[PDB]
Design a protein around this ligand. Structure first.
Ligand code: FES
Length: 109
């Protein structure tokens, strides 16, 4: 399915259209296309730097785990449609995704 990344001043100025594979995470699809979404804990579901908001298609994605939910409670700019992009896997529906203006990372320099 197609994943549209909304325009992001720092990581995707004009936005982008990604052709993602079913079962593939939003993050891996983004990274293959050179969209550098931060992933501090290396896709271990232990941070919130890969946080994204699924504006369209949130219901198509597999429900978030208990471990993911706990991490999201720490996410800056949390919304009902927030997901850790390293955990959210595309299924059979096109998505519209927004990368947050900021993400909390106590280890950032
Ligand atoms: S990269 Fe750390 S939770 Fe996704």
């Amino acid at each position: 399915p197609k994943i549209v990344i909304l325009p992001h001043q720092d990581l995707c100025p004009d936005g982008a259209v990604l052709e993602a594979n079913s079962g593939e995470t939003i993050l891996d699809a983004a990274l293959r296309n050179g969209i550098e979404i931060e992933h501090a804990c290396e896709k271990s579901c232990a941070c919130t730097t890969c946080h994204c908001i699924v504006r369209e298609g949130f219901d198509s994605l597999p429900e978030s785990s208990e471990q993911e939910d706990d991490m999201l409670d720490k996410a800056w700019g949390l919304e009902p449609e927030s997901r850790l992009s390293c955990q959210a896997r595309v299924t059979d529906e096109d998505l519209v995704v927004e990368i947050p203006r900021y993400t909390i990372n106590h280890a950032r320099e």
